[PDB]
């Protein structure tokens, strides 16, 4: 939900967006999101990845939002596209919003964060 | 945290 795509209050284009995806219930504020609108500013597709191919990939971070770590979690099968986006979460580095977390919240959620990284709108 | 799905990267086309 970042750069031009909120919801379904957004009058981006024709885009009936009525089931998007995971809301947040206990925690993971505009946290996880963050995350991934950085992760994709570092992030590269490879002409490899498909219009549904998926890395989780398992980040390791300090209270500040710096990545202490990050790998493939659970690989697409090409490792490329799961390293390309490990390389999309390394290059972030260090993310804003964990430092205005609970250190028991920021541990529970982002202290790793799990990123999946599933492609829209490839060339195929 | 539940791992969000990023489908996004370089403003490629």
Same mark, same amino acid.
């Given at each position: 939900?970042?750069?031009?795509? #909120? %919801?379904?209050?957004?009058?981006?284009?024709?885009?009936?967006?009525?089931?998007? *995806?995971?809301?947040?219930?206990?925690?993971?504020?505009?946290? *996880?999101?963050? +995350?991934?609108?950085?992760?994709?500013?570092?992030?590269?597709?490879?002409?490899? #990845?498909?219009?549904?191919?998926? =890395? %989780?990939?398992?980040?390791?971070?300090?209270?500040?939002?710096? +990545?202490?770590?990050?790998?493939?979690?659970?690989?697409?099968?090409?490792?490329?596209?799961?390293?390309?986006? =490990? #390389?999309?979460?390394?290059? =972030?580095?260090?993310?804003?919003?964990?430092?205005?977390?609970?250190?028991?919240?920021?541990?529970?959620?982002?202290?790793?964060?799990?990123? +999946?990284?599933?492609? %829209?709108?490839?060339?195929? | 945290?539940?791992?969000?799905?990023?489908?996004?990267?370089?403003?490629?086309?």
């Amino acid at each position: 939900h970042m750069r031009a795509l #909120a %919801e379904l209050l957004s009058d981006t284009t024709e885009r009936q967006q009525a089931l998007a *995806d995971e809301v947040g219930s206990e925690v993971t504020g505009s946290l *996880d999101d963050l +995350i991934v609108n950085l992760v994709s500013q570092q992030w590269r597709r490879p002409p490899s #990845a498909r219009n549904g191919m998926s =890395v %989780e990939v398992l980040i390791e971070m300090l209270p500040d939002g710096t +990545i202490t770590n990050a790998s493939v979690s659970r690989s697409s099968g090409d490792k490329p596209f799961d390293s390309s986006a =490990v #390389a999309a979460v390394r290059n =972030v580095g260090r993310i804003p919003e964990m430092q205005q977390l609970p250190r028991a919240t920021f541990d529970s959620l982002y202290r790793q964060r799990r990123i +999946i990284f599933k492609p %829209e709108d490839l060339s195929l | 945290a539940d791992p969000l799905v990023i489908s996004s990267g370089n403003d490629r086309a």
